[PDB]
Amino acid sequence: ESYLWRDSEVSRSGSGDEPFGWVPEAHSVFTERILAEEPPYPCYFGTQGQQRGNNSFSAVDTRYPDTHGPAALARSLRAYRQRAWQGPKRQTLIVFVGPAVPGAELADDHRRFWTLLDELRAYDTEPWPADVPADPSDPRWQWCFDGEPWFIFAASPAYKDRRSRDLGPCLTLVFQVRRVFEGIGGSTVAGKAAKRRVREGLARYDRIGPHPTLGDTDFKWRQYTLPDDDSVAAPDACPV
């Protein structure tokens, strides 16, 4: 009944042409990308999280939206949020949205991403947090669920130049609670070293450099769905 999986549980998601039958292969493709030796995956935090058993997984099967869709993902997210505050600091939930769609464009996957975030709102059982403005045009808006803001981004096979965001054949949502950044705040010595290391890795991996919206940080929504080029979306244009 729970669709929240540790690595060792993903194989039981589905087998053959069943709901989630495509999830085990997506999980393997994801881990291959994140654990690749040369060039290394640019975000060493993600690689380390995978190596240390701190990544959890879920999925949405678009063929079965009423049973394997946003309502179930809301339950999975509530369970993940509990896990994310009890376990190690640096955990990530990776959610595969499938089956894969041959020929989808990046804008299509981004539209699906924002739609899924919108559908999740109806299933949130907690009020919106008082410290985060609820208006998505506010410079300080962040996506919130189950009582707190999250960091979230969309990965897609349609990221041809920003290869670091191609995690396999499906639209893939990467969720973290903000606890993961404790110790690497942007002002911090450690945070500046972290950005150096990741951005050096990006320059060995991607066909386009770090996006300007990553910072040099209002309007975080623009980082959720980076474009594949240097375009910069209008700040008040968040689709939610």
Using the rule CB under 6 A, is 223 a contact of ligand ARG? yes
The tokens for 76 are: 């999975």
DSSP class of 122:
T
In the shown chain, the binding pattern of residues 158 to 197 toward ligand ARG, with x for contact by CB under 6 A and - for none, equals -----------------------x----------------
With CB under 5 to 8 Å by kind, the binding choice for 10 among ligand HEM, ligand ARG, none is none
Using the rule CB under 6 A, is 220 a contact of ligand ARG? yes
173, HSE (Cβ side, Cα atoms, 13 Å):
25
Residues that bind ligand HEM (CB under 6 A): 34, 42-43, 45-46, 49, 55, 90, 92, 94, 153, 164-165, 174, 176, 180-181, 184, 194-195, 198-199, 214-215, 223, 226
| SS3 per residue for 213-225 | HHCCCCCCHHHHC
With CB under 5 to 8 Å by kind, the binding choice for 77 among ligand HEM, ligand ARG, none is none
Q: Cα dihedral sign for 90, 117, 163, 208?
A: negative
Torsion angle defined by CA atoms of residues 217, 174, 54 and 10, in that order, rounded to the nearest 10 degrees? 180
Nearest distance in Å: CB 122, ligand HEM = 27
Tell me whether residue 20 is exposed, middle or buried, using C-beta atoms within 10 angstroms of its C-beta: 0 to 12, 13 to 18, 19 or more: buried
Residue numbers at the binding site for ligand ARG (CB under 6 A) = 151, 153, 181, 214, 217, 220, 223
